[PDB]
Design a protein around this ligand. Structure first.
Ligand SMILES: CC(C)CCC[C@@H](C)[C@H]1CC[C@H]2[C@@H]3CC=C4C[C@@H](OC(=O)CCC(=O)O)CC[C@]4(C)[C@H]3CC[C@]12C
Ligand SMILES: CC(C)CCC[C@@H](C)[C@H]1CC[C@H]2[C@@H]3CC=C4C[C@@H](OC(=O)CCC(=O)O)CC[C@]4(C)[C@H]3CC[C@]12C
Ligand SMILES: CC(C)CCC[C@@H](C)[C@H]1CC[C@H]2[C@@H]3CC=C4C[C@@H](OC(=O)CCC(=O)O)CC[C@]4(C)[C@H]3CC[C@]12C
Ligand SMILES: CC(C)CCC[C@@H](C)[C@H]1CC[C@H]2[C@@H]3CC=C4C[C@@H](OC(=O)CCC(=O)O)CC[C@]4(C)[C@H]3CC[C@]12C
Lengths: 218, 212
């Protein structure tokens, strides 16, 4: 029988098996890094391996592996892995296989680890709020730097997200600071707001009544 | 981080999704998807439900990129569009009897395709074996669209669909044993005669009116 239809080619079986264990490893690493999200900072080597192994297949086995069937496992699985990378925006915080993005990401994760070191020994949620308050603001200021940088260095679209483990690290500590520790203290200027608002809202009452009364008098 | 009892519902789902993805690939070129790791897909679906049964908050919607949700959606979409439900029974712990019958027929059909290589003998020795396999496949095409009430005949189990396409391409394309009967001369004669009728009708109508 021809070594294409009923069975795999000798050089196509190994290529498919090589891509098989690479895709299995990436999928296992994706789940283990789902919570807390350490996706782009842990799965970046395995994702590159999968993409490279896709290229070797799609170079002498492309016909027998890529579009040989109605359902294309290798195409959809690699497309799914690509979509996961793009949606996670792991291109950010990864400058051509480099861990950082102009050292911004390692600095953020170093700051995030430093910031989270406060929230452990400052409990025994009172002493955390004022002791290293600037540590949270230092991290929070840096995060806003990347948002504007992401619209200048990258310039994809206003509102584009950064790489997910950076974005998740902000939310881990934002919810750990303004929600569990209640260290957020807005001033809540209320009585002057009420006095000013009722004064402005009372102006149309004067204007319409005075206009009506003045016309009636004359 | 998560509590240790929460890094048990994600670690077991991790190795379950890893081995399912490993099988999805190594069972792709000769498509044996729905028949090799139908239990691995069931394990993933069950272990996903275990999470939603005390870690749903901490794992499912805890962040923007819901990895477990999209991974399970991808596995579900792969199973659904591959129509692997047709391959196994309704209770779905073993292959259907009809599907099991097709697979051994496919092995039986492919047996002569190798036996009769040493393609004149192939087209004669078990030509009926190809037709009984082809008839059975068409039988499931209509049976499938009545079982699940699908209006068109679109997609069977990908193992069955690929097995037939392997045989069809091995029979009508490489062994070219499919020889349709053509009568070009009788077709030309009748088609020319019919196409010549409007010529007579329009000319006779024109000539009849010209004559007074
Ligand atoms: C005199 C006529 C023509 C206008 C009347 C206007 C009132 C119907 C409005 C104007 C300002 C409003 C107030 C503006 C702000 C607040 C605070 C709000 O809740 C808070 O205390 C929030 C405090 C915070 O967010 O820090 C409750 C409603 C109240 C009293 C509002 C009640 C309705 C008020 C008095
Ligand atoms: C929910 C609200 C705050 C949205 C904004 C709408 C109001 C601020 C506006 C809508 C119509 C306005 C009113 C339109 C007409 C008049 C009549 C005017 O006096 C009269 O009744 C004159 C005629 C008469 O004397 O019978 C006094 C102002 C008043 C109530 C206006 C006050 C301001 C009003 C309530
Ligand atoms: C008398 C006037 C008014 C009409 C003349 C019509 C012709 C121009 C047509 C009618 C039938 C046609 C034929 C019908 C079928 C065929 C077979 C066809 O051969 C195949 O492709 C056979 C193999 C296959 O089926 O793939 C080649 C064209 C031919 C000769 C056609 C050529 C053009 C023909 C002669
Ligand atoms: C076969 C497919 C590709 C085309 C289908 C259309 C033809 C079969 C039809 C279209 C117009 C028809 C023609 C319309 C009018 C005439 C004129 C008629 O008489 C004349 O030639 C004299 C008319 C005059 O002197 O006014 C003869 C048939 C003919 C050619 C008809 C023959 C059949 C034709 C070509």
């Amino acid at each position: 029988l021809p070594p294409d239809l009923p069975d795999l080619d000798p050089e196509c079986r190994e290529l498919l098996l090589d891509f098989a264990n690479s895709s299995a490893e990436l999928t296992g690493c994706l789940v283990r890094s789902a919570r807390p999200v350490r996706l782009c900072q842990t799965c970046y080597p395995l994702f590159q391996q999968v993409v490279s192994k896709m290229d070797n297949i799609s170079r002498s086995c492309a016909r027998s592996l890529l579009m040989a069937d109605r359902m294309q496992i290798v195409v959809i699985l690699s497309e799914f892995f690509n979509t996961t990378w793009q949606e996670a925006n792991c291109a950010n915080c990864l400058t051509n296989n480099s861990e950082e993005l102009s050292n911004s990401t390692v600095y953020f994760l170093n700051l995030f680890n430093h910031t989270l070191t406060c929230f452990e020994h400052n409990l025994q949620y009172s002493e955390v709020c004022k002791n290293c308050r600037e540590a949270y603001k230092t991290l929070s200021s840096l995060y806003s730097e990347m948002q504007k940088m992401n619209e200048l260095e990258n310039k994809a679209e206003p509102g584009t997200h950064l790489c997910i483990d950076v974005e998740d690290a902000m939310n881990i500590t934002r919810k750990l600071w303004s929600r569990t520790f209640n260290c957020s203290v807005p001033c809540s200027d209320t009585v002057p707001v009420i006095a000013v608002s009722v004064f402005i809202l009372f102006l149309p009452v004067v204007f319409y009544l005075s206009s009506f009364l003045h016309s009636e008098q004359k």
